[model samples]
Target: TPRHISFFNIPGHGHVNPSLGIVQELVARGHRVSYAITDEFAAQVKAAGATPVVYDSILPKESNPEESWPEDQESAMGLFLDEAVRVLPQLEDAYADDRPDLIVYDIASWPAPVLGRKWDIPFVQLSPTFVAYEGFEEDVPAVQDPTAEDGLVRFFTRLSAFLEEHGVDTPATEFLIAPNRCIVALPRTFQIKGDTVGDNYTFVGPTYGDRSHQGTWEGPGDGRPVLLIALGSAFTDHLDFYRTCLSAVDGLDWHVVLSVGRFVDPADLGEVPPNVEVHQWVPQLDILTKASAFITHAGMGSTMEALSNAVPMVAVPQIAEQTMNAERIVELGLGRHIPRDQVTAEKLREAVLAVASDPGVAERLAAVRQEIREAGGARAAADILEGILAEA
Candidate 1:
């Protein structure tokens, strides 16, 4: 009999993307999976061979992405708590009737951990970015990026009180703290481990199959290194920033392929440089395969794509989480982060050149690439999921 499972996630690319390869793998293996998500991603979920369980769109979506709360680093903890408080009851209502064998959740989908306990099902946390150590708080006190007082404490207190209503004796802090088996979605090259990362957290590495469904980029380039410019899925509303890139790399020794995304118009960007090729959308994976360096929004998807293809990046992080990812890229010796406010032509050009010439970055990227190839992309991840189902 086909194994029955249910997948739940937010509508954004960061949360939805990591699971794509795994969904493809499970569907190929003939498992019956139902995607319990919003209508916006119905096609993507169905294409992955999962039964679609469309929910009423309660959370803010890509079309109208809310400025995720507590904009500053200090308020991130409070922001998460506030947001969670707002959304958890809605999620509880959505899933109250339609329980499944297991619940696969994104970290932001806090209700999943609580609901999984209520239904007594296995819950998996697919870490789309950094994997927090067993106790990241205690080990690195100064690195209190997620704010402790109002943010972490308030959020966990609510979740803990809710879970205690059931029979779970786990601390409020540990509730939704981490997944049962954390599938770290980033490549090993993207992290700087303080303590040895555990066996429990599977570094599935970059899953680098064909990421595009439209077609491939097989055309020969004009004998120049191709520089892919992308601002990622949700946060591409930076026309001014793209113009900065235009100034930074214009007349440089490269064939620039820019994905301006929907936020900016080709006309709004002014005249394109003769050396640059502008597109509302581009074949990202294919471009990375042959590209020299990438100018990106430091999205997890784009960053991982660059690293897996062994390409370095100039990450201009647009959001707080992206700042963390961008910092990781630099720490991992793969790239540099020049914040949006600091994105001058000199700074952008300098950062790009620094990353491009850094031999250590290249070596780290190559090593990580080899490890990812050996880890077996979607198949390895599917095998882990199958193991979970077997225990069930």
Candidate 2:
């Protein structure tokens, strides 16, 4: 019999995007699937052949929280706890009558475990980014409190009460992770302390097969090497950084494709150089396959996509977790990171040229791409879910 599957995710591209291909695959395989999502992503779920169960999300709308939330441990913890208090009840109400045979949830959907227990159903975690490994404590920087101790205390106090009400005894920190079967949607090589990661976490690389709606771009075909520069959807408002990139490639031999995103106007970028092409957004996978190098904000999704295409990058991480990914890029010898404080035209030019010319980085990129293919993408994730359902 075809098993009924349900998916729940937060209202963000990074959280919802990685699972689309797998959802498509499950639907293709004759399984009935429903995706609990917001209107912002209802179309994507529908396009993937899954039923969209729309809900109201309480979290802030910005795809990148670093831009909205304060850079402090207390503020981050408090906001997440507050959102949980509001959003978890809505999810419970939505799924009360229509429970599926199994559930698939994102890492940020903190209410998932509660719902799984409430309905006595098995749920698999679909992690779009790297999960903490055994040695994560050694590398992770300690969070320094920036005042607001009272708010931090209340955050955890209320959070404990909420989970207890749901009959969960796990601490707030442990509840953040998926307790049972987890399919990490990133290559194992990108994981910190990958060899030591547990069996519960299955690294299935990235799922990038069915990206819909975003239009494609055909390069200039002038035979000049193409350098694609994008800070992704959320961090593209940095006009100064965009200008620095413009100066970096000025009169260079390559054709530059720049995506400045919607927050900034092209007029703000001033005179356009003949060698450069600017757009508000470009088809990322289409461009990556053809480009020589990429300048990125080091978002995990972007990182995986770059490595999947065997394209090297010069990473400029804009926030906290991104710096960790940036460090892994350098450690893996696939790219380099340019600190924001030192982001001048001259430095940016040298960094781009260095990665573009380095044959060693090119070899690493090819090897990583092969590993991604071998690990399987959407197909592997679907296979795992099949096993979970069969066991039940």
Candidate 3:
């Protein structure tokens, strides 16, 4: 029987973008895919060669950024929990009549795996960032403490209760967390506790293919080192941050390509020096392949792209997984981690120069890139999904 997979994901560019490469690969192999998502991402869903099944969930929009994301760390975690609780019914309805042969879901879409169990269908969790494992406590001790419960924990507890209320007896907390198989789109070399990742968690590395939306930065005309600057997509509202990057590189021998996302107008950023070029967006992969150093928000997509090209980075983490992603880069000795509050022109300059000029970071990144490349990302991902489908 032909496997019919339905994927569910939020409408974020970062999460959807990484999976597009995998979905594209699947489509090329003649697999049928239907993306259960919002009208907001319909074009993106179609671009990946999947049919779109629009679901009208109350997931927060970009204009309502404060709703989905709070200013403080603790508050943001709470907001994410609240959002997930409210969206569960929407997910259930989205698939009620249109059940898929297998469920392929992003990590954020918890209901996909849960619903799969209800339908007795196979489910695969696709991650665009790092995932938590058993021994995550060793490096980040927070992962080990079952006592310190967050809103997500409470929400899941209530979810299990809600499922039980509907006569579906899911008694354990693990029912809400564990997926049949987890496909991680990151390098295992980046995992803090690699051995703890378990049998079901497979590191497919970053499955990056060409996307319709790409950056447009070639290389510097002169032979000077190039510094590629981007704050990823959602947090590009930080013009001051890019200004600091430019200020840091003034009179330096490096050429800078700064992508301001959508928030800042190039004219507002003032006069450009010959060494610096300003754009609203740049084809990130193209630049990464040629870049000497990458300055990013440490969004997992950007981080993995840099790592794929073996480009060193200076990570000024903005929000969410950016901090964790950036921290891991520092831990891996591939980059520097500068928190938003502590970012300065001098510090930024020093970090960029250090990562770019240091032969050690370059060599280690090159070696790690080879390891990640050999991980066999999309094919491995398809193989795992195919096995799950066979079991069904």
Candidate 4:
């Protein structure tokens, strides 16, 4: 029987894009999927085969990919808490009369947990990044001292009352981490330790399939191998790095596709070689399909894309989460990591060339690609969601 599924999500591309395939799959399986999103993503949600339940969001929009909120860890998190507090009521007005059978939301969608509990409905968190593991607190004890940052103290103080008003008396810390169920969007191998997650979690890898709507891309249409350099969506303001990349690939017989994100105009790059093409944003997945190597920010979404296409990478992480992901790229033997502070023309040149031509990198990448494929992508995520609803 067909049932209603409501999906709540923010505007981050890394968060929303991975789940598109799963959303489409759920719709294909004869479920009514209503996707709550901002106006900018309404078309993309519609294209995914889910009816877009558009909502006004104070969070950043997709059209402005490079615009960042509070750069600090706590302030940035506080921004999400602020969004959650406001968006929950808008969600209340939208679905108060018509409730969904299940709630599936992105990890950043703070309102989902509240709605699920208020209505006594089950919910699933679709994590676009790494989920905390068995020893995560010990490995990274930052969360142990929430008060270490004043922003956390304020965030928890506000969060405590926010939950209380909705009749959810659970402690804020426990409430933050505890969702009824979670379906991770990346394969276990990509996860730290890749094992030891509890029974409630299911790692379905990335839900990548048939992204033709994003657009199609072609190679340089020449004999030179393809190399793609992009810093994912959020952190693409590095023209110096682009210049460094330009110098690195000078006359290297490689076609360089440089995605100089929203904030950086292609004109700012100035005087590009015939081997390199610059753009505000390229069809990343399409380009990756033909790319021999990638220079990236090590955002898990981009890392997974490279791995899925069996393309080796040279990771230059811009932030803490990305730094961890970059380390993983090196550890998995599929690529190299050049820290942002340590990157240069010569270093990038050497790493990209090394990974692109190394048979060992290719071998390891093929193994990971197989692992991702077998882990079931979007189809598996949808099946798990259905199973949970079936139990209800």
Using lDDT as the measure, the top candidate is 4
Error of 4 at 194 (Å): 2.7
lDDT of 1 by residue, 337-368 (tens): 88788779888878777777789888988986
RMSD of each: 3.7, 2.7, 3.3, 1.6
Task: Tell me the lDDT of model 1 at 341.
Answer: 89
* TM-score quality measure for candidate 4: 0.96
lDDT of 4 by residue, 294-317 (tens): 999999899989988999999998
TM-score of each: 0.83, 0.92, 0.86, 0.96
Model 2 CA lDDT for position 148: 56
Q: What is the lDDT of candidate 2?
A: 0.81
User: Could you tell me the C-alpha RMSD of candidate 2 in Å?
Assistant: 2.7
How do all the candidates rank in terms of TM-score, highest first? Answer: 4, 2, 3, 1
Q: Which residue runs of candidate 2 sit more than 4 Å off their true CA positions?
A: 63-74, 135-148
User: What is the per-residue lDDT of model 2 for residues 1-392, given as tens digits with 9 covering 90 to 100?
Assistant: 79889998887676787888899899988999999888878887898999998887666565433444345645666666676677778877877787888999888677778888888889889998888787563454222222256775576677778889988887765675435779998978888788888999999999866675665677788898899998765656688889988988999999999988777778889998889988887888778888899999888888888888998899998877788899999999999998777789998888889998899999999899999999889999999999989987
Return the TM-score for candidate 2, rounded to 2 decimals.
0.92
The best candidate by TM-score is 4
Q: Judged by TM-score relative to the true structure, which candidate is superior, 2 or 4?
A: 4
Which window of 10 residues has the lowest lDDT sum in candidate 4? 140-149
Runs in model 4 deviating more than 4 A are: 145-148
